[PDB]
A = this chain, B = another copy of it.
């Protein structure tokens, strides 16, 4: 029912649009104001915040949210650090998007429940669509 999406890039905004279509509350948060405005018309609540800030994550009660998606791609260090802060925040289910195999290794060990690699994961499905 209630979801949170951190990082509103091309991947993160795509999650927000589909989540809203199924009638679910989505908290879209992004450091960049422009990207938050784009998702403002597609989510229940759009907030400009830095999710690397520990106190900011405390205020945004992410432990209440059923699932939290971290969709930060360019800065590998932010996604790793935001994943950790969400874990101490009490988030039971943490989904993290990783662009590299080395990042996906770190995220697995630090405790991410689901690691998403869009290029590798889309590669497998597109092959399956080609086969059938």
Contact = CB atoms under 8 A, between A and B. Distances in A.
Interface of A: 1, 3, 9-19, 22, 24, 52, 67, 69, 71, 73, 76-78, 80-81, 84-85, 88, 95, 97, 100, 102-103, 105-106, 109-111, 114, 116-131
Q: Is the interface of A mostly helix, strand, loop or mixed?
A: helix
Contacts of A17: 123-124, 127
A95 B15 contact: no
Name the residue among A12, A84, A105 with the largest chain B CB count within 10 angstroms: A105
A117 B77 contact: no
Given A22-B128, A84-B105, 15 more contacts: A10-B123, A14-B124, A15-B123, A17-B123, A18-B123, A18-B124, A19-B130, A73-B119, A80-B80, A84-B106, A85-B109, A95-B126, A97-B126, A106-B110, A118-B118
